[PDB]
PDB file of C-alpha atoms in Angstrom:
ATOM      1  CA  UNK D   2      -3.147  13.835  18.049  1.00 44.79           C
ATOM      2  CA  UNK D   3      -2.448  12.156  14.620  1.00 44.31           C
ATOM      3  CA  UNK D   4      -3.696  14.034  11.523  1.00 45.16           C
ATOM      4  CA  UNK D   5      -6.964  15.446  11.321  1.00 44.75           C
ATOM      5  CA  UNK D   6      -8.780  17.570   8.406  1.00 49.25           C
ATOM      6  CA  UNK D   7      -5.088  18.076   7.562  1.00 51.62           C
ATOM      7  CA  UNK D   8      -4.201  15.444   4.746  1.00 49.76           C
ATOM      8  CA  UNK D   9      -6.603  17.374   2.337  1.00 47.62           C
ATOM      9  CA  UNK D  10      -4.425  20.227   2.433  1.00 47.53           C
ATOM     10  CA  UNK D  11      -1.162  18.308   2.292  1.00 46.02           C
ATOM     11  CA  UNK D  12      -2.461  16.125  -0.498  1.00 44.59           C
ATOM     12  CA  UNK D  13      -3.570  19.244  -2.463  1.00 44.29           C
ATOM     13  CA  UNK D  14      -0.201  20.708  -1.980  1.00 41.95           C
ATOM     14  CA  UNK D  15       1.398  17.444  -3.107  1.00 42.60           C
ATOM     15  CA  UNK D  16      -0.420  17.824  -6.935  1.00 42.34           C
ATOM     16  CA  UNK D  17      -3.158  15.202  -6.182  1.00 42.26           C
ATOM     17  CA  UNK D  18      -6.144  17.210  -6.583  1.00 40.38           C
ATOM     18  CA  UNK D  19      -7.022  16.024  -9.813  1.00 40.49           C
ATOM     19  CA  UNK D  20      -7.301  12.636  -8.621  1.00 39.07           C
ATOM     20  CA  UNK D  21      -8.274  12.623  -4.964  1.00 41.12           C
ATOM     21  CA  UNK D  22     -11.752  11.857  -3.923  1.00 40.32           C
ATOM     22  CA  UNK D  23     -11.315  12.927  -0.160  1.00 38.54           C
ATOM     23  CA  UNK D  24     -11.105  11.104   3.011  1.00 36.97           C
ATOM     24  CA  UNK D  25     -13.025   8.782   4.507  1.00 34.78           C
ATOM     25  CA  UNK D  26     -14.043   6.356   7.404  1.00 37.73           C
ATOM     26  CA  UNK D  27     -13.952   2.679   7.009  1.00 36.85           C
ATOM     27  CA  UNK D  28     -17.324   2.707   4.844  1.00 34.68           C
ATOM     28  CA  UNK D  29     -15.542   4.407   1.873  1.00 31.27           C
ATOM     29  CA  UNK D  30     -17.911   2.826  -0.935  1.00 29.52           C
ATOM     30  CA  UNK D  31     -15.267   2.424  -3.275  1.00 30.11           C
ATOM     31  CA  UNK D  32     -14.150   3.894  -6.978  1.00 29.88           C
ATOM     32  CA  UNK D  33     -16.556   4.433  -9.745  1.00 27.84           C
ATOM     33  CA  UNK D  34     -13.533   5.323 -11.758  1.00 24.71           C
ATOM     34  CA  UNK D  35     -13.817   3.190 -15.036  1.00 25.18           C
ATOM     35  CA  UNK D  36     -11.640   5.660 -17.035  1.00 24.53           C
ATOM     36  CA  UNK D  37      -9.755   8.312 -14.211  1.00 21.89           C
ATOM     37  CA  UNK D  38      -7.118   7.570 -11.825  1.00 23.16           C
ATOM     38  CA  UNK D  39      -8.526   7.948  -8.520  1.00 22.61           C
ATOM     39  CA  UNK D  40      -7.361   7.734  -4.924  1.00 22.51           C
ATOM     40  CA  UNK D  41      -8.271   7.971  -1.290  1.00 23.59           C
ATOM     41  CA  UNK D  42      -7.557   8.432   2.377  1.00 25.48           C
ATOM     42  CA  UNK D  43      -9.616   6.040   4.587  1.00 25.03           C
ATOM     43  CA  UNK D  44      -9.479   5.153   8.175  1.00 25.47           C
ATOM     44  CA  UNK D  45      -9.971   1.693   9.779  1.00 24.88           C
ATOM     45  CA  UNK D  46     -12.760   2.990  12.070  1.00 20.55           C
ATOM     46  CA  UNK D  47     -16.008   4.457  11.560  1.00 19.84           C
ATOM     47  CA  UNK D  48     -16.519   8.336  11.750  1.00 18.41           C
ATOM     48  CA  UNK D  49     -18.774   7.495  15.138  1.00 16.66           C
ATOM     49  CA  UNK D  50     -15.542   6.587  17.376  1.00 19.93           C
ATOM     50  CA  UNK D  51     -12.890   9.236  16.044  1.00 19.01           C
ATOM     51  CA  UNK D  52     -10.690   7.680  14.016  1.00 18.61           C
ATOM     52  CA  UNK D  53      -8.127   5.261  14.551  1.00 20.22           C
ATOM     53  CA  UNK D  54      -5.631   4.795  11.677  1.00 23.64           C
ATOM     54  CA  UNK D  55      -5.061   5.696   8.065  1.00 24.04           C
ATOM     55  CA  UNK D  56      -4.691   4.230   4.944  1.00 20.15           C
ATOM     56  CA  UNK D  57      -4.311   4.950   1.325  1.00 25.29           C
ATOM     57  CA  UNK D  58      -6.350   3.238  -1.853  1.00 23.71           C
ATOM     58  CA  UNK D  59      -5.522   4.073  -5.214  1.00 25.66           C
ATOM     59  CA  UNK D  60      -7.533   2.985  -8.611  1.00 28.33           C
ATOM     60  CA  UNK D  61      -5.212   2.414 -11.825  1.00 27.05           C
ATOM     61  CA  UNK D  62      -8.466   1.778 -14.689  1.00 30.17           C
ATOM     62  CA  UNK D  63      -5.639   1.430 -17.476  1.00 29.05           C
ATOM     63  CA  UNK D  64      -3.415  -1.075 -15.431  1.00 28.12           C
ATOM     64  CA  UNK D  65      -6.570  -2.484 -13.710  1.00 27.01           C
ATOM     65  CA  UNK D  66      -5.028  -2.194 -10.194  1.00 30.67           C
ATOM     66  CA  UNK D  67      -6.159  -0.995  -7.063  1.00 32.74           C
ATOM     67  CA  UNK D  68      -3.503  -0.057  -4.430  1.00 33.83           C
ATOM     68  CA  UNK D  69      -3.407  -0.391  -0.680  1.00 31.27           C
ATOM     69  CA  UNK D  70      -0.936   1.061   1.272  1.00 34.32           C
ATOM     70  CA  UNK D  71      -1.740   0.699   5.039  1.00 32.66           C
ATOM     71  CA  UNK D  72       1.622   2.398   6.709  1.00 31.22           C
ATOM     72  CA  UNK D  73       2.173  -1.010   8.581  1.00 30.24           C
ATOM     73  CA  UNK D  74       1.912  -3.335   5.911  1.00 30.35           C
ATOM     74  CA  UNK D  75      -0.630  -5.808   8.312  1.00 29.22           C
ATOM     75  CA  UNK D  76      -1.881  -8.837   6.574  1.00 31.70           C
ATOM     76  CA  UNK D  77      -5.549  -9.030   5.890  1.00 31.19           C
ATOM     77  CA  UNK D  78      -5.992 -10.957   8.937  1.00 30.09           C
ATOM     78  CA  UNK D  79      -4.179  -8.750  11.206  1.00 28.79           C
ATOM     79  CA  UNK D  80      -6.201  -5.606   9.953  1.00 33.03           C
ATOM     80  CA  UNK D  81      -9.512  -7.362  11.018  1.00 31.38           C
ATOM     81  CA  UNK D  82      -7.933  -8.340  14.502  1.00 31.30           C
ATOM     82  CA  UNK D  83      -6.274  -5.327  15.223  1.00 27.16           C
ATOM     83  CA  UNK D  84      -8.332  -2.650  13.452  1.00 26.44           C
ATOM     84  CA  UNK D  85     -11.722  -5.093  12.627  1.00 26.04           C
ATOM     85  CA  UNK D  86     -11.604  -3.361   9.271  1.00 27.15           C
ATOM     86  CA  UNK D  87     -12.218  -5.267   6.033  1.00 28.68           C
ATOM     87  CA  UNK D  88     -11.798  -4.052   2.684  1.00 29.42           C
ATOM     88  CA  UNK D  89     -13.691  -6.733   0.758  1.00 27.34           C
ATOM     89  CA  UNK D  90     -16.533  -5.011   0.078  1.00 27.92           C
ATOM     90  CA  UNK D  91     -15.116  -1.655  -1.301  1.00 29.59           C
ATOM     91  CA  UNK D  92     -12.890  -3.497  -3.329  1.00 31.30           C
ATOM     92  CA  UNK D  93     -16.140  -5.615  -4.639  1.00 30.09           C
ATOM     93  CA  UNK D  94     -17.840  -2.528  -5.402  1.00 28.89           C
ATOM     94  CA  UNK D  95     -14.917  -0.844  -6.970  1.00 26.39           C
ATOM     95  CA  UNK D  96     -14.646  -3.737  -9.448  1.00 24.23           C
ATOM     96  CA  UNK D  97     -18.479  -3.703 -10.393  1.00 23.97           C
ATOM     97  CA  UNK D  98     -18.426  -0.198 -10.998  1.00 24.06           C
ATOM     98  CA  UNK D  99     -15.060   0.558 -12.689  1.00 26.10           C
ATOM     99  CA  UNK D 100     -14.043  -2.750 -14.524  1.00 28.10           C
ATOM    100  CA  UNK D 101     -15.572  -3.737 -17.533  1.00 27.31           C
ATOM    101  CA  UNK D 102     -14.751  -7.532 -16.666  1.00 27.13           C
ATOM    102  CA  UNK D 103     -15.586  -7.014 -12.639  1.00 28.86           C
ATOM    103  CA  UNK D 104     -11.944  -7.721 -12.148  1.00 30.84           C
ATOM    104  CA  UNK D 105      -9.025  -5.971 -10.594  1.00 32.30           C
ATOM    105  CA  UNK D 106      -5.285  -6.491  -9.643  1.00 29.58           C
ATOM    106  CA  UNK D 107      -5.200  -5.924  -5.693  1.00 26.63           C
ATOM    107  CA  UNK D 108      -1.562  -4.549  -4.907  1.00 24.40           C
ATOM    108  CA  UNK D 109      -0.955  -3.875  -1.441  1.00 28.11           C
ATOM    109  CA  UNK D 110       1.913  -3.266   0.776  1.00 30.03           C
ATOM    110  CA  UNK D 111       3.262  -5.936   2.746  1.00 30.30           C
ATOM    111  CA  UNK D 112       5.785  -3.837   4.887  1.00 30.39           C
ATOM    112  CA  UNK D 113       6.388  -1.271   7.577  1.00 31.83           C
ATOM    113  CA  UNK D 114       7.362   2.131   7.133  1.00 31.40           C
ATOM    114  CA  UNK D 115       6.016   3.325  10.428  1.00 33.76           C
ATOM    115  CA  UNK D 116       7.225   2.834  13.779  1.00 36.29           C
ATOM    116  CA  UNK D 117       4.771   1.238  16.100  1.00 34.67           C
ATOM    117  CA  UNK D 118       4.791   4.297  18.589  1.00 34.72           C
ATOM    118  CA  UNK D 119       4.507   6.782  15.418  1.00 35.05           C
ATOM    119  CA  UNK D 120       1.215   8.911  15.127  1.00 33.57           C
ATOM    120  CA  UNK D 121       2.370   9.804  11.419  1.00 30.47           C
ATOM    121  CA  UNK D 122       0.262   7.005   9.324  1.00 27.33           C
ATOM    122  CA  UNK D 123      -1.784   9.804   7.877  1.00 26.30           C
ATOM    123  CA  UNK D 124       1.239  11.711   6.628  1.00 23.14           C
ATOM    124  CA  UNK D 125       2.960   8.847   5.142  1.00 19.97           C
ATOM    125  CA  UNK D 126      -0.732   7.896   3.000  1.00 19.05           C
ATOM    126  CA  UNK D 127       0.007  11.795   1.962  1.00 22.25           C
ATOM    127  CA  UNK D 128       3.251  10.571   0.718  1.00 21.37           C
ATOM    128  CA  UNK D 129       2.210   7.747  -1.071  1.00 18.51           C
ATOM    129  CA  UNK D 130      -0.753   9.430  -2.849  1.00 19.79           C
ATOM    130  CA  UNK D 131       2.176  11.968  -4.165  1.00 17.86           C
ATOM    131  CA  UNK D 132       4.105   8.992  -5.797  1.00 16.49           C
ATOM    132  CA  UNK D 133       0.777   7.479  -6.974  1.00 15.69           C
ATOM    133  CA  UNK D 134       0.035  10.762  -8.938  1.00 16.33           C
ATOM    134  CA  UNK D 135       3.667  11.008 -10.330  1.00 16.15           C
ATOM    135  CA  UNK D 136       3.902   7.112 -10.901  1.00 14.04           C
ATOM    136  CA  UNK D 137       0.617   5.568 -11.136  1.00 15.21           C
ATOM    137  CA  UNK D 138       1.989   2.294 -12.496  1.00 12.14           C
ATOM    138  CA  UNK D 139       4.758   1.900  -9.580  1.00 11.25           C
ATOM    139  CA  UNK D 140       3.887   4.199  -6.814  1.00 10.44           C
ATOM    140  CA  UNK D 141       4.891   1.551  -4.204  1.00  8.08           C
ATOM    141  CA  UNK D 142       8.753   1.945  -4.843  1.00  6.49           C
ATOM    142  CA  UNK D 143      11.203   2.183  -7.504  1.00  7.56           C
ATOM    143  CA  UNK D 144      10.352   5.585  -7.473  1.00  8.13           C
ATOM    144  CA  UNK D 145      11.677   9.269  -6.670  1.00  6.37           C
ATOM    145  CA  UNK D 146       9.465   9.437  -3.706  1.00  4.93           C
ATOM    146  CA  UNK D 147       9.269   6.304  -2.266  1.00  5.24           C
ATOM    147  CA  UNK D 148      13.032   5.864  -2.745  1.00  5.66           C
ATOM    148  CA  UNK D 149      13.177   8.018   0.411  1.00  3.17           C
ATOM    149  CA  UNK D 150      11.764   5.301   2.923  1.00  5.80           C
ATOM    150  CA  UNK D 151      12.554   1.905   3.444  1.00  5.62           C
ATOM    151  CA  UNK D 152       9.981  -0.578   4.674  1.00  4.39           C
ATOM    152  CA  UNK D 153      10.546  -3.804   6.512  1.00  3.01           C
ATOM    153  CA  UNK D 154       9.085  -7.217   7.196  1.00  3.20           C
ATOM    154  CA  UNK D 155       5.809  -6.355   9.395  1.00  4.38           C
ATOM    155  CA  UNK D 156       6.767  -9.390  11.322  1.00  2.72           C
ATOM    156  CA  UNK D 157       9.766  -6.885  12.522  1.00  2.00           C
ATOM    157  CA  UNK D 158       7.499  -4.213  13.436  1.00  3.58           C
ATOM    158  CA  UNK D 159       8.382  -4.115  17.106  1.00  2.70           C
ATOM    159  CA  UNK D 160      12.147  -5.410  16.891  1.00  3.91           C
ATOM    160  CA  UNK D 161      14.861  -3.009  18.354  1.00  2.00           C
ATOM    161  CA  UNK D 162      16.902  -3.907  15.242  1.00  3.25           C
ATOM    162  CA  UNK D 163      14.730  -1.595  12.670  1.00  4.28           C
ATOM    163  CA  UNK D 164      13.188   0.964  14.952  1.00  4.94           C
ATOM    164  CA  UNK D 165      16.223   3.569  13.598  1.00  6.60           C
ATOM    165  CA  UNK D 166      15.391   2.841   9.978  1.00  9.11           C
ATOM    166  CA  UNK D 167      11.830   3.615  10.824  1.00  7.08           C
ATOM    167  CA  UNK D 168      12.823   6.531  12.751  1.00  9.61           C
ATOM    168  CA  UNK D 169      14.698   7.751   9.604  1.00 10.03           C
ATOM    169  CA  UNK D 170      11.904   7.160   7.278  1.00  4.83           C
ATOM    170  CA  UNK D 171       9.731   9.594   9.647  1.00  5.81           C
ATOM    171  CA  UNK D 172      12.472  12.224   9.233  1.00  2.69           C
ATOM    172  CA  UNK D 173      12.419  11.897   5.726  1.00  3.86           C
ATOM    173  CA  UNK D 174       8.876  11.993   5.614  1.00  5.66           C
ATOM    174  CA  UNK D 175       8.831  15.604   7.322  1.00  6.12           C
ATOM    175  CA  UNK D 176      11.567  16.909   4.921  1.00  4.85           C
ATOM    176  CA  UNK D 177       9.572  15.613   1.954  1.00  3.76           C
ATOM    177  CA  UNK D 178       6.844  17.370   3.079  1.00  3.95           C
ATOM    178  CA  UNK D 179       8.705  20.833   3.838  1.00  5.41           C
ATOM    179  CA  UNK D 180       9.967  20.661   0.499  1.00  3.99           C
ATOM    180  CA  UNK D 181       6.220  20.243  -0.963  1.00  3.60           C
ATOM    181  CA  UNK D 182       3.740  21.605   1.153  1.00  3.32           C
ATOM    182  CA  UNK D 183       3.283  25.080   1.996  1.00  5.12           C
ATOM    183  CA  UNK D 184       0.313  23.993   4.192  1.00  3.91           C
ATOM    184  CA  UNK D 185       3.108  21.566   6.395  1.00  2.28           C
ATOM    185  CA  UNK D 186       5.781  24.457   6.436  1.00  2.00           C
ATOM    186  CA  UNK D 187       3.561  26.431   8.142  1.00  2.00           C
ATOM    187  CA  UNK D 188       2.197  23.870  10.542  1.00  2.00           C
ATOM    188  CA  UNK D 189       5.526  22.163  10.848  1.00  2.00           C
ATOM    189  CA  UNK D 190       6.317  22.319  14.338  1.00  2.00           C
ATOM    190  CA  UNK D 191       2.550  21.750  15.511  1.00  2.00           C
ATOM    191  CA  UNK D 192       2.466  18.410  13.076  1.00  2.00           C
ATOM    192  CA  UNK D 193       5.863  17.275  14.128  1.00  2.00           C
ATOM    193  CA  UNK D 194       4.575  17.287  17.562  1.00  2.00           C
ATOM    194  CA  UNK D 195       1.327  15.866  16.748  1.00  2.00           C
ATOM    195  CA  UNK D 196       2.401  12.957  14.653  1.00  2.00           C
ATOM    196  CA  UNK D 197       5.667  12.066  16.538  1.00  2.00           C
ATOM    197  CA  UNK D 198       7.799   9.003  16.315  1.00  2.00           C
ATOM    198  CA  UNK D 199       7.306   7.842  19.874  1.00  2.00           C
ATOM    199  CA  UNK D 200       3.930   9.745  19.937  1.00  2.00           C
ATOM    200  CA  UNK D 201       2.109   6.651  21.100  1.00  2.00           C
ATOM    201  CA  UNK D 202       4.638   5.082  23.127  1.00  2.00           C
ATOM    202  CA  UNK D 203       3.240   3.408  26.692  1.00  2.00           C
ATOM    203  CA  UNK D 204       4.073   4.653  29.705  1.00  2.00           C
TER     204      UNK D 204
ATOM    205  CA  UNK R   1       9.612   1.893  -0.500  1.00  2.00           C
ATOM    206  CA  UNK R   2       7.459  -1.187   0.267  1.00  2.00           C
ATOM    207  CA  UNK R   3       7.202  -4.345  -1.346  1.00  2.00           C
ATOM    208  CA  UNK R   4       3.943  -5.449  -2.241  1.00  2.00           C
ATOM    209  CA  UNK R   5       1.446  -8.621  -2.993  1.00  2.00           C
ATOM    210  CA  UNK R   6      -0.315  -8.772  -6.053  1.00  2.00           C
ATOM    211  CA  UNK R   7      -3.723 -10.522  -6.302  1.00  2.00           C
ATOM    212  CA  UNK R   8      -6.177 -11.004  -9.110  1.00  2.00           C
ATOM    213  CA  UNK R   9      -9.657 -10.518  -7.761  1.00  2.00           C
ATOM    214  CA  UNK R  10     -12.912 -11.214  -9.857  1.00  2.00           C
ATOM    215  CA  UNK R  11     -16.407 -10.470  -8.611  1.00  2.00           C
TER     216      UNK R  11
END
């Protein structure tokens, strides 16, 4: 299942409407936002294939920062090898369009908050964007939203040692969305089932 | 939250 055409409703519930460009596939052009905070949810795949995995990009023109929150925190190389996904192009187009000097600071997550069998990627992205909308200079951590979940080194993604941390992250995610999204509340059971912690576990 | 890496990029 995962999350489909749902993020929009949830992200709107979370107060991101004034900054949210929408959901895109891997062809996301980038940001043309020299003066305003902006963000987007971006799939690793093209629309042609259905959608594989969700990430969040956010742009702060005042701090000159582009944020990438991909819930597993994979390296660029692992994004290319696991998902055939490259964000160099959209980063370049964003900086050309949005920065007077054609430069930016890329800030990207290096830790996993999501279990390796979880289908909650899209929901984690929604949570990050609430953090961005409310704390645009420190969306990754040290803020009330992201203080609710704990990243672990991406190298330990499949370690039995950290699985309870990642399960608790998912519990906090859902409860976060219960508290802040009427859309989530009214679809609570269906979304939990379609995004569950062991949803993609191999049999 | 998550730790993050920062990279200056110019195009």
